[PDB]
Nucleic acid binder design. Structure first.
Ligand SMILES: Cc1cn([C@H]2C[C@H](O)[C@@H](COP(=O)(O)NP(=O)(O)CP(=O)(O)O)O2)c(=O)[nH]c1=O
Ligand SMILES: [Cl-]
Ligand SMILES: [Cl-]
Ligand SMILES: [Cl-]
Ligand SMILES: [Mg+2]
Ligand code: NA
Ligand code: NA
Ligand code: NA
Length: 326
DNA sequence: CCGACAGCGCATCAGC
DNA sequence: GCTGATGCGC
DNA sequence: GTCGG
C-alpha cells in the first residue's frame, strides 16, 4: 500500500460514479486504475508517472497531481459536502439498495438509518435483511473464522450426500487473511452440462445448513445460486459472532474448472481475464470457454481439464489464486 | 474520433 | 400465467 | 474515463 492515498481517492470517485452519477463505465474505469496502481511496486511521484500504467489516462493523471500536491481532491471535497450525494452513497451500503432505489428513497425524504428503520414497510425482503444486519455486513471475517465456517459447511454438505464437493472460493481461496464474506462453489455428479438427474440439489444443502442454524436468512435463492446470511455458533457465555454474507453457487460438475476460476476472482481479475479472452478471440463464462467466429458468434465449448487450460487458450502464463487479487 | 467496456443468476415489474 | 426489461447482485 | 485501431 505504497499508494494508499491515491487508490482510496480513485475508489471514492468510482463509488460516486456508480452510486450517484449512475455511470457504470466511469465506475469501472476508476476501479481499473485503482487496481493497476495498487500493485504498482513504487511510491508514485507524479501523474505523468502513473499515466504510464494502462488504465490511467490524462484526467486521472491530473487528479493524482492535485492529490500529491495537496493531499486532497477538491472534486471529492465538494462531493462529501453535498447532502443528496452523501445520502445516496450511504443508502447504497445497505444490501439490496442500489443507485436507483437509493435515489428514490432520498426523493421521499428517507435518507438515514433511522429513516430506513421507521420505513421498514417500504423495503423488499432483501433490503429488510440488509438493514437488519447493516452493522454486521461491514465487518471483515478473520481467516480463522473462515476456516471454522469451511469446516461446518463441508461437513454438513457431506452429511447430505457424500458425493457433493463444496469448495470455498472468493478472497478465501486467494489466500486473504480476511474476507468480506464466504463464497462456496458446489458440485454434485447428478448435475452436469448434459443433465440434471436429481432435483433440489441446492435446496437440500441450504435446508441442512439452516437446520443446524448456520444459515439464518435468505436474500435470494434459485436452482443454482443462493444468496443469504450465516453465523458461527458461539460458546457458553460468549458474545455472538457477527452475522455474515454467504454466496453459494451450484455448477455443473463437468464444468468445475470454469466455475472455480469464475468464483475465485477477483472480480477485476475476471473482467481483465475475460476482456483479454475476447482480444484473443475467445469468450469465457463460469461454464465454458468458447471460440469466437468471424461474425462474433460463440462456437462450441473447448475441452477444459484444469484451470491452467483456460489460461493456455488465451496465452497467459498460469496465475495461482493468490496472484489474482486485482 | 468512437465504439466497447465480462458475463450471468434471481427478484420485480410492465405489458400482454 | 409468460416474456422481456430493469435493478441488484455474484 | 480509457484505450485500440
Ligand atoms: C462482485 C463480482 C464477483 N465475481 C466473482 C468473482 C469473485 O471473487 C466471486 C465472489 O464474489 P465476492 O463479491 O464475494 N468477491 P471476493 O473476491 O470474495 C472479495 P470479499 O467477498 O472477500 O470482500 O465472484 C465476479 O465475477 N464479478 C463480480 O462483479
Ligand atoms: Cl458510464
Ligand atoms: Cl480527497
Ligand atoms: Cl456456456
Ligand atoms: Mg467473497
Ligand atoms: Na496509461
Ligand atoms: Na447496496
Ligand atoms: Na460473495
Amino acid at each position: 500500500t505504497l499508494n494508499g492515498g491515491i487508490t482510496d481517492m480513485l475508489t471514492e470517485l468510482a463509488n460516486f460514479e456508480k452510486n450517484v452519477s449512475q455511470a457504470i463505465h466511469k465506475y469501472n474505469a476508476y476501479r481499473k486504475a485503482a487496481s493497476v496502481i495498487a500493485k504498482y511496486p513504487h511510491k508514485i511521484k507524479s501523474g505523468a508517472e502513473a499515466k504510464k500504467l494502462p488504465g490511467v489516462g490524462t484526467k486521472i493523471a491530473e487528479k493524482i497531481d492535485e492529490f500529491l500536491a495537496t493531499g486532497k481532491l477538491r472534486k471529492l471535497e465538494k462531493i462529501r459536502q453535498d447532502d443528496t450525494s452523501s445520502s445516496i452513497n450511504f443508502l447504497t451500503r445497505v444490501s439490496g439498495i442500489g443507485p436507483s432505489a437509493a435515489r428514490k428513497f432520498v426523493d421521499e425524504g428517507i435518507k438515514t438509518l433511522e429513516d430506513l428503520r421507521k420505513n421498514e414497510d417500504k423495503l423488499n425482503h432483501h433490503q429488510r435483511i440488509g438493514l437488519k444486519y447493516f452493522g454486521d455486513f461491514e465487518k471483515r471475517i478473520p481467516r480463522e473464522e473462515m476456516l471454522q465456517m469451511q469446516d461446518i459447511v463441508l461437513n454438513e454438505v457431506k452429511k447430505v450426500d457424500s458425493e457433493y464437493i463444496a469448495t470455498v472460493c472468493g478472497s478465501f481461496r486467494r489466500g486473504a487473511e480476511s474476507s468480506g464474506d464466504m463464497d462456496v462453489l458446489l458440485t454434485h455428479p447428478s448435475f452436469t452440462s448434459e443433465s440434471t438427474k436429481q432435483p433440489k440439489l441446492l435446496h437440500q444443502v441450504v435446508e441442512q445448513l439452516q437446520k443446524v442454524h448456520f444459515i439464518t436468512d435468505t436474500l435470494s435463492k434459485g436452482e443454482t445460486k443462493f444468496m443469504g446470511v450465516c453465523q458461527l455458533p458461539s460458546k457458553n457465555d460468549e458474545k455472538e459472532y457477527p452475522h455474515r454474507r454467504i454466496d453459494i453457487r451450484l455448477i455443473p460438475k463437468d464444468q468445475y474448472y470454469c466455475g472455480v476460476l469464475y468464483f475465485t476472482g477477483s472480480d477485476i481479475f475476471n473482467k481483465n481475464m475475460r476482456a483479454h479472452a475476447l482480444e484473443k478471440g475467445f469468450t469465457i463464462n463460469e461454464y465454458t470457454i468458447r471460440p469466437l467466429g468471424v461474425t462474433g458468434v460463440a462456437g462450441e465449448p473447448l475441452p477444459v481439464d484444469s484451470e491452467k487450460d483456460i489460461f493456455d487458450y488465451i496465452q497467459w502464463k498460469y496465475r495461482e489464486p493468490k496472484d489474482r487479487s486485482e
